[PDB]
Amino acid sequence: MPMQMFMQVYDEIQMFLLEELELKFDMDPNRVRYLRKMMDTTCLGGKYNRGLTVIDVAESLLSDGARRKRVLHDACVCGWMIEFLQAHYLVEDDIMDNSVTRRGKPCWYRHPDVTVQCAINDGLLLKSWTHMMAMHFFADRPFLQDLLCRFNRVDYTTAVGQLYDVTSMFDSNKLDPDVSQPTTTDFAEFTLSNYKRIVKYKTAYYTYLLPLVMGLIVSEALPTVDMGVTEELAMLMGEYFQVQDDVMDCFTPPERLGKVGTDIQDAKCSWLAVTFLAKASSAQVAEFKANYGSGDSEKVATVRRLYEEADLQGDYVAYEAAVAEQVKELIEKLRLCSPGFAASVETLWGKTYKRQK
């Protein structure tokens, strides 16, 4: 049922958006068709965990069936706002990361009939749609300003995180727009401290915090929860989520992952890289440095081999157990004053812990 209602609201959203373009933007049928395909390709096909979380949180906290109908419809719209914001980030990210596939299909910019220049702008259209749907459904809601204030702040935080992500292989000391420099050679910025910052801002806020907050807002329950503990939870689960993403990038097969990994080739400051460099022997580190950040098949294979030799999967399972311990504690802390909200956080945790995605 939650999935059923979520998909029905997608239809309403898509119909509103596409029918407007025809009538208000002088758009021809061919370009309306193009944008319908863009929307469908970029926003559908994932698990909708962010979207579905908003619904779960909203319904969990409202406790007269008219108000339930309304809150649930508002939660569906908020959920699609987050899914569209994500779709926006993934279109741009794939171009930025030179990725090949996503969800088992070509990246948007890699479709045979999409130009990179169009794809950049298509990503922008996706973000605009979040604002368009918000105004269409919420123009008369008293929570609109607070909703969008928070939504926009998380959008901002994500872009700040993406900056951390894309500048992480560069000695930050040598960062100057008017100069230029190659990939790091000592990898001295590949610290856990730096990793934690990247991951908090690029992923945790929009993936974990935002769904929770929007759910709280449409159920008009925000002030009822300890926001400090909630944020702690969100950051911890979001860090772990990105750690899983990084591990899967190297170790999960494309048929199950849906995407071809690029972290090695792009010289990303991944969890694998930072953890490997902190533990690996001198010879291992030297071979890593000589092979990392190259598209060369065998250099990538060398790095994959080194990660395998360093038993990084091992370290992950241990990181995983420590995270799970802290999650339980914080959920129990939240349950003290907000048992309903804590139950929804537990479900979000259940969708995350040991995910095979």
Ligand X SMILES: O=P(O)(O)C(O)(Cc1cccnc1)P(=O)(O)O
Which residues make up each annotated binding site for Mg(2+)? 93-94, 97, 165, 245, 249, 263
From the list 92-100, 109-117, 283-291, 323-331, the region that binds ligand X by CB under 6 A is: 92-100
* Residue 122 binds ligand X, judged by CB under 6 A: no
* Residue 156 binds its own copies, judged by CB under 8 A: yes
Nearer to Mg ion, 56 or 93 (CB): 93
* Residue 59 binds Mg ion, judged by CB under 5 A: no
**Distance of alpha carbon 175 from alpha carbon 185, whole angstroms:** 15
Q: Which residues carry a binding-site annotation? A: 93-94, 97, 165, 245, 249, 263
* Residue 201 binds its own copies, judged by CB under 8 A: yes
**Residues 78-117 interacting with its own copies (rule: CB under 8 A):** 92, 95-97, 108, 111-115, 117
Tokens of 193: 């401290």
- 10 Å CB burial of residue 111 (0-12, 13-18, 19+) is middle
**Binder of Mg ion out of 57, 249, 271, 292 (CB under 5 A):** 249
Burial pattern 238-273, b for ≥16 Cβ within 10 A else e, equals bbbbbbbbbbbbbbbeeeebbbebbbbbbbbbbbbb
Judge whether 43 and 83 are in contact, CB under 8 Å: yes
Q: In terms of C-beta distances under 8 Å and separation of at least 24 residues, what long-range contacts does 10-15 make, across chains too?
A: 10/43, 10/44, 10/80, 13/77, 13/80, 13/133, 14/39
Judge whether 88 and 123 are in contact, CB under 8 Å: yes
Closest CA to 60 of 343, 348, 350: 343
Judge whether 294 and 266 are in contact, CB under 8 Å: no
Nearer to Mg ion, 219 or 242 (CB): 242
Tokens of 195: 């990793």
Judge whether 55 and 75 are in contact, CB under 8 Å: yes
**# chain residues binding Mg ion, by CB under 5 A:** 4
* Residue 176 binds its own copies, judged by CB under 8 A: yes
Residue located via tokens 């598209």: 295
**Residues 39-78 interacting with its own copies (rule: CB under 8 A):** 41
* Residue 202 binds ligand X, judged by CB under 6 A: yes
CA atoms within 13 A on the CB side of 214: 35
Residue 102's DSSP bridge partners are: 105
* Residue 83 binds ligand X, judged by CB under 6 A: no
Judge whether 57 and 341 are in contact, CB under 8 Å: yes
From the list 182-190, 241-249, 271-279, 307-315, the region that binds Mg ion by CB under 5 A is: 241-249
The site string for ligand X over 161-180 (x = CB under 6 A, - otherwise) reads: -x------------------
Nearer to its own copies, 92 or 263 (CB): 92
Tokens of 74: 């508002």
- SS3 category, 356: coil
**Nearest 5°: CA angle at 134, between 206 and 64?**
100
Query: At closest approach, how far in Å is the CB of 25 from its own copies?
Result: 5
* Residue 203 binds ligand X, judged by CB under 6 A: yes
- Per CB under 8 A, residues contacting its own copies are 21, 25-28, 30-31, 33-35, 37-38, 41, 92, 95-97, 108, 111-115, 117-118, 120-122, 124-125, 128-129, 131-132, 135, 139, 144-145, 148-149, 152-153, 155-157, 159-160, 162-164, 166-167, 172-173, 175-181, 197, 200-201
- Per CB under 6 A, residues contacting ligand X are 89-90, 93, 97, 99, 158, 162, 202-203, 245, 249
- Per CB under 5 A, residues contacting Mg ion are 93, 97, 245, 249
